[PDB]
Ligand SMILES: C[C@H](CCC(=O)NCCC[N+](C)(C)CCCS(=O)(=O)[O-])[C@H]1CC[C@H]2[C@@H]3[C@H](O)C[C@@H]4C[C@H](O)CC[C@]4(C)[C@H]3C[C@H](O)[C@]12C
Ligand SMILES: C[C@H](CCC(=O)NCCC[N+](C)(C)CCCS(=O)(=O)[O-])[C@H]1CC[C@H]2[C@@H]3[C@H](O)C[C@@H]4C[C@H](O)CC[C@]4(C)[C@H]3C[C@H](O)[C@]12C
């Protein structure tokens with residue numbers, strides 16, 4: 001079908017593989033703009049004008065895994081490794097709550113040191129502050145996930161990365177798509193609000209792969225979906241590969257919103273890294289969440305999944321104020337509660 005016809009099918013929610021492929025393959029400006037408007041309007045209708053702030057503390061860059069894309073991979077010897085103490089992490093969380101954060105995200109490499117009990121202790125302390133806690137710690141045994149839920153954790157982010165099992169295993173040689181999915185299913189069973197999502201523009205990833213990523217997200221009806229471009233890192237095997245395209249990645253965000261109209265979708269830091277102002281554009285094309293960097297110096301600059309990240313030269317407390325200004329200049333509002341998913345049951 002033509003652009004106008006694909007848009008009509010999207011508006012009528014005829015989400016066939018062919019409609020999603022054609023939406024991702026058409027490069028016409030008018031079509032893309034209309035797709036972006038559609039996603040923006042669906043966002044406003046379902047999740048409103050509140051942009052939810054998730055303050056992220058990247059508390060350790062130690063990792064046991066060796067993912068080919070990631071600057072924290074275990075084989076990268078050209079990176080100073082760091083670990084925040086549990087006291088530092090709690091007090092840094094308390095500062096974010098003082099600054100108005102209503103969710104604290106704890107993210108790390110897969111660092112065995114904390115697992116599971118030091119994380120449980122931290123979570124319990126942060127939960128006393130009356131905020132949501134989200135974990136993004138990678139793949140762990142069911143048992144660990146269960147202990148963290150009992151400790152009070154509310155949400156868990158585990159991007160599925162790529163729904164192509166062959167590409168997944170090549171890029172993540174310690175593990176598999178099956179394992180990743182099983183972790184995601186376990187987290188949902190345990191009562192977490194669960195986040196998935198993928199990178200766009202991975203080496204070897206095709207448009208058909210991106211369609212499969214959308215259908216996977218739609219299948220499992222995730223609470224949150226984190227999408228960004230692949231950004232090559234010079235101390236990795238994928239150093240010389242092409243970066244993911246911003247517009248294609250933005251279309252993935254827009255389609256995610258159309259497919260999952262009541263979901264929580266961030267404007268990721270990676271989007272703001274590859275294009276100046278990329279988060280702001282993404283917030284106008286389907287996204288409704290922002291995750292300001294709350295990692296303190298001198299560690300912030302050592303948490304380099306990809307290079308050139310924005311927010312590295314700012315002061316320790318700048319990023320929450322910075323996103324509150326962004327939200328205002330976008331004519332949006334800050335989140336009034338924890339920003340949990342508010343499901344709209346349909347037919
Ligand atoms: C700001 C620019 C330039 C527009 C422009 O230059 N016009 C503004 C003022 C001109 N006036 C209206 C005052 C009168 C025109 C008389 S004049 O004499 O200037 O031609 C317009 C041009 C194309 C617009 C984007 C696309 O839609 C896609 C998408 C839709 C979403 O939903 C919201 C996000 C997004 C990215 C849009 C944002 C923004 O909105 C853009 C960049
Ligand atoms: C942390 C310190 C010291 C006092 C303190 O420890 N304050 C705890 C407040 C706890 N809460 C945020 C939950 C209050 C909600 C009140 S509210 O009426 O907003 O619901 C206080 C003193 C002045 C406060 C800033 C200014 O105000 C301007 C601005 C208002 C925004 O809005 C949030 C961001 C920002 C930058 C504020 C952040 C933080 O807060 C500051 C630095």
Ligand SMILES: Nc1ncnc2c1ncn2[C@@H]1O[C@H](CSCC[C@H](N)C(=O)O)[C@@H](O)[C@H]1O
Pocket residue numbers: 069070071107108109110136137138139157158159161198199228229230231232233270305306
């Ligand atoms: N080079 C790169 N470009 C863009 N995103 C990257 C990247 N390297 C890693 N990421 C993204 O960063 C996310 C957080 S990684 C930290 C969390 C945890 N270890 C985990 O793997 O889940 C990953 O899910 C991945 O999608």
Ligand SMILES: O=C(O)[C@@H]1CS[C@H](C(=O)O)N1
Pocket residue numbers: 157225226227228266268269270271291
């Ligand atoms: O873009 C980034 O740098 C981060 C990586 S994970 C987080 C998300 O939850 O989407 N975004």
Ligand code: SF4
Pocket residue numbers: 063064065066067070071072073074108109110138
């Ligand atoms: S993506 Fe997560 S698990 Fe993979 S190397 Fe990076 S930090 Fe470790």
Ligand SMILES: [Cl-]
Pocket residue numbers: 054103105134155
């Ligand atoms: Cl969250």
Ligand SMILES: [S]
Pocket residue numbers: 293310311312314318319320322
């Ligand atoms: S920041």
